[PDB]
Amino acid sequence: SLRSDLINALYDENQKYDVCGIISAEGKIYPLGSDTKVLSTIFELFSRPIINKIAEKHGYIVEEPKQQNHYPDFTLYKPSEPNKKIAIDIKTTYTNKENEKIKFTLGGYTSFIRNNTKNIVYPFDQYIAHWIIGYVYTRVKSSLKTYNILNEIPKPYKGVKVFLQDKWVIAGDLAGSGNTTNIGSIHAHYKDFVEGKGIFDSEDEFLDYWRNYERTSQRNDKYNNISEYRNWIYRGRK
Amino acid sequence: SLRSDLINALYDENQKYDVCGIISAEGKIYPLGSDTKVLSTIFELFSRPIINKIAEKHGYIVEEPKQQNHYPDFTLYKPSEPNKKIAIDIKTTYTNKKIKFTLGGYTSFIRNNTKNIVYPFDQYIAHWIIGYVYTRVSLKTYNINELNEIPKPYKGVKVFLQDKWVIAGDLAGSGNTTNIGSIHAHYKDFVEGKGIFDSEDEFLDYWRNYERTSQLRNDKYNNISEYRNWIYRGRK
DNA sequence: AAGATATCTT
DNA sequence: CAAGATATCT
Ligand SMILES: [Mn+2]
Ligand SMILES: [Mn+2]
Ligand SMILES: [Mn+2]
Ligand SMILES: [Mn+2]
Ligand SMILES: [Mn+2]
């Protein structure tokens, strides 16, 4: 499928190529930094050509937000099925030591999930799937000078791993951020995201949970986690 | 000076080079995107070796944050006087052809000496802003021989180095993330320092006492004139 | 002015 | 974990 081919292409590109710098049209290269702000951007730009190639191979149109601050990073759709759009979002996180547990922030829970056209390229109800291409990397004089046309240039990361999974599948029950009201993913090992070991039973449960999750702990008398939500649901949503 | 040599070096590097992609050790090039989140990152990495070069020429050690989410991008200090550090922070904004920058939070290091800062705030004697302004303009890969044909995600870029206080405005630059907003002016005003604050003392005091929401501010002050009136009322 | 867009630190 | 930080934009 488009999906099996997408993840295959991503997993494969990550194996065969290592980003190591920014290059100008004149051939001068500037090294990269080791913080997530830099790597998330690098990993996303590294993903863009692959995502588009595969989509074109499957007859899908690819569209990126025309305006900034609009989810998702990529919208894939066939003209023939305008209401079956697929949102693909690239997310990145780090770890100081490989194999440790990781967590991702999975977008806000007060924008498009609560409002059909809020901060999304197309209305939420036109997408039938929301995929997450998650990247994980172990943080790592040389990075201070410029280089000319590779191999010597030090790479600010170690053991980059990539996965593709449904957002609802890896969604957790605890916020991924406070003042920016983000859904938090499960806090588990990379293998757990690949195998889809989340906490919701269905996409509808994930949606209902985040659509009724309160903004601050002061959730006290509603629900703060999946167990409480199920009890809340059992009682009649009150 | 270090400042004049840095400003010059910045201008020259900007005139001489156009970043056009990310390159792998294998020679394959991925193009750049056209949003601030991407450009801010590129403009900053572009700034690093030059800031480091001039610092070396002047005998300053350069330190970047070891920890994420800590101001500033670059901490410079001479090995003899460690208590007189210079903070250099890169900021970026776009133009579809008057501009404004967010200038960092007003509830972190300026209210607490050790909050979100690499070194105590009181060890810094200067806070410089290297501002990049770009006019907003592929999904294919390229090789070295195709450098000149890689589409740039910007039509033109202008860079400036000014003191933070000098370009600071009086309205926030963000709400839930409580950032100071710069003045809303033309690129030339940032270069020439046509601010609103009478002094860095006034800038600091204004942002250290700016309330987070309009409700709170409406009892104190929402702009420069009101803060001045608040001062006269005895800071009450 | 308030709150979105992406992640991380305390 | 929560809350609030990191950078910008809508
Ligand atoms: Mn994007
Ligand atoms: Mn993304
Ligand atoms: Mn962890
Ligand atoms: Mn919109
Ligand atoms: Mn700290």
Side-chain angles (χ1 to χ4, degrees), chain A residues 1-15 17-36 38-55 57-60 62-65 68-96 100-114 116-138 140 142-143 146-190 192-196 198-216 219 222-223 225-238, chain B residues 1-15 17-33 35-36 38-65 68-80 82-83 85-96 98-99 101-111 113-135 137-138 141-144 146-187 189-193 195-214 217-218 220-236:
Chain A
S1 40
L2 167 62
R3 184 180 175 148
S4 61
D5 279 356
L6 190 47
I7 188 52
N8 274 188
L10 293 159
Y11 183 94
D12 181 44
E13 192 84 359
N14 180 52
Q15 294 296 128
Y17 301 120
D18 280 11
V19 179
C20 64
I22 299 306
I23 181 169
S24 45
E26 305 76 15
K28 191 181 190 185
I29 312 165
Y30 308 62
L32 309 170
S34 53
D35 56 289
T36 303
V38 165
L39 275 342
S40 55
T41 293
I42 293 311
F43 293 158
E44 173 164 337
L45 295 175
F46 184 79
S47 298
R48 304 174 61 257
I50 304 158
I51 292 179
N52 183 71
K53 164 183 174 178
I54 305 305
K57 175 199 162 178
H58 287 253
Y60 283 82
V62 172
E63 286 195 6
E64 293 187 286
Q68 314 196 52
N69 301 9
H70 280 69
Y71 163 94
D73 282 340
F74 279 85
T75 290
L76 271 55
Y77 69 91
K78 289 149 88 178
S80 43
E81 42 216 39
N83 272 12
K84 294 200 178 183
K85 300 196 169 77
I86 303 167
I88 304 178
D89 217 51
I90 308 185
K91 300 179 180 299
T92 302
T93 192
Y94 87 106
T95 194
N96 291 294
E100 292 181 316
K101 285 189 186 176
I102 54 176
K103 179 164 181 165
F104 295 89
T105 54
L106 306 167
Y109 57 77
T110 73
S111 57
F112 50 84
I113 88 156
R114 297 190 191 219
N116 201 52
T117 59
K118 191 175 167 181
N119 295 98
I120 188 168
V121 178
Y122 288 90
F124 192 76
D125 60 354
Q126 288 166 28
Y127 296 84
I128 37 79
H130 300 276
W131 302 339
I132 301 288
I133 296 173
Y135 278 93
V136 196
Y137 75 95
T138 292
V140 159
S142 306
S143 71
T146 53
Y147 297 80
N148 59 276
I149 305 298
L150 306 178
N151 287 143
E152 260 84 21
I153 304 184
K155 290 177 294 293
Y157 55 81
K158 273 199 310 179
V160 180
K161 301 178 186 182
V162 62
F163 64 73
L164 181 313
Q165 182 61 267
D166 297 85
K167 182 187 293 174
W168 80 265
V169 172
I170 59 174
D173 54 347
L174 305 180
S177 77
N179 55 0
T180 51
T181 59
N182 261 239
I183 290 182
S185 74
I186 53 176
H187 174 248
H189 298 283
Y190 168 70
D192 294 305
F193 290 85
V194 171
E195 301 169 16
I199 56 171
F200 294 98
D201 263 34
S202 67
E203 186 166 15
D204 283 23
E205 187 190 56
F206 151 77
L207 281 172
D208 184 57
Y209 183 100
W210 290 103
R211 279 167 173 175
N212 297 276
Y213 185 83
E214 297 287 339
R215 282 137 143 137
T216 61
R219 294 188 297 265
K222 199 173 173 186
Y223 58 93
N225 53 42
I226 196 58
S227 302
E228 293 175 20
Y229 163 84
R230 282 163 182 167
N231 187 25
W232 182 73
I233 288 293
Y234 191 86
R235 295 190 313 275
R237 305 170 79 84
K238 72 174 195 292
Chain B
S1 44
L2 165 67
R3 184 181 173 146
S4 63
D5 277 357
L6 189 52
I7 295 182
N8 290 337
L10 288 169
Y11 290 165
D12 292 349
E13 194 75 2
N14 194 60
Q15 295 298 306
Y17 303 100
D18 278 307
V19 287
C20 61
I22 50 180
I23 187 165
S24 47
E26 296 77 28
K28 195 179 182 165
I29 305 158
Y30 305 68
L32 300 180
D35 55 281
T36 295
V38 165
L39 281 328
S40 56
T41 294
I42 311 299
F43 290 155
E44 164 154 357
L45 300 174
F46 183 77
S47 303
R48 305 167 67 239
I50 319 318
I51 295 174
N52 190 85
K53 190 192 196 298
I54 308 308
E56 294 178 321
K57 169 184 177 176
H58 291 259
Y60 285 69
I61 294 170
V62 182
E63 292 190 25
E64 288 178 75
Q68 302 196 66
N69 296 350
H70 279 51
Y71 166 88
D73 294 322
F74 302 87
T75 291
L76 288 59
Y77 66 100
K78 291 186 305 312
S80 47
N83 306 109
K85 300 188 163 109
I86 302 164
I88 308 188
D89 209 64
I90 314 294
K91 304 283 195 196
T92 310
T93 197
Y94 80 109
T95 61
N96 314 48
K98 287 193 298 178
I99 65 176
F101 296 85
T102 42
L103 300 178
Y106 60 82
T107 64
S108 45
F109 50 83
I110 71 170
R111 302 205 176 191
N113 200 52
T114 309
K115 183 165 195 160
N116 291 99
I117 189 152
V118 182
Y119 281 111
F121 184 80
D122 63 6
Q123 302 183 10
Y124 294 81
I125 61 176
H127 297 268
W128 299 348
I129 293 305
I130 289 178
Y132 279 97
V133 202
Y134 77 86
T135 300
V137 291
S138 92
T141 48
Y142 300 87
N143 64 66
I144 313 281
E146 311 178 287
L147 293 173
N148 289 39
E149 65 192 58
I150 301 189
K152 295 170 197 307
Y154 51 77
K155 300 184 185 60
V157 174
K158 277 189 280 74
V159 67
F160 72 66
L161 185 150
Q162 191 50 274
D163 288 90
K164 185 189 291 191
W165 83 261
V166 172
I167 57 169
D170 56 356
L171 305 197
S174 63
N176 60 2
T177 52
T178 59
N179 258 242
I180 295 165
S182 72
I183 51 186
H184 176 219
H186 294 321
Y187 167 75
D189 283 335
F190 289 86
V191 178
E192 295 180 353
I196 65 171
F197 288 116
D198 176 73
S199 63
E200 176 166 17
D201 178 72
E202 196 178 51
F203 152 75
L204 273 184
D205 187 57
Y206 182 94
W207 286 102
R208 281 168 166 169
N209 298 280
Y210 187 89
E211 300 292 342
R212 305 165 187 63
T213 68
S214 301
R217 291 196 295 282
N218 275 235
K220 278 180 73 165
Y221 57 86
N222 301 271
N223 57 49
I224 195 67
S225 304
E226 292 185 358
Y227 153 79
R228 283 166 179 165
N229 200 269
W230 179 71
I231 294 295
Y232 158 81
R233 297 187 310 267
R235 305 169 71 89
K236 63 166 64 63

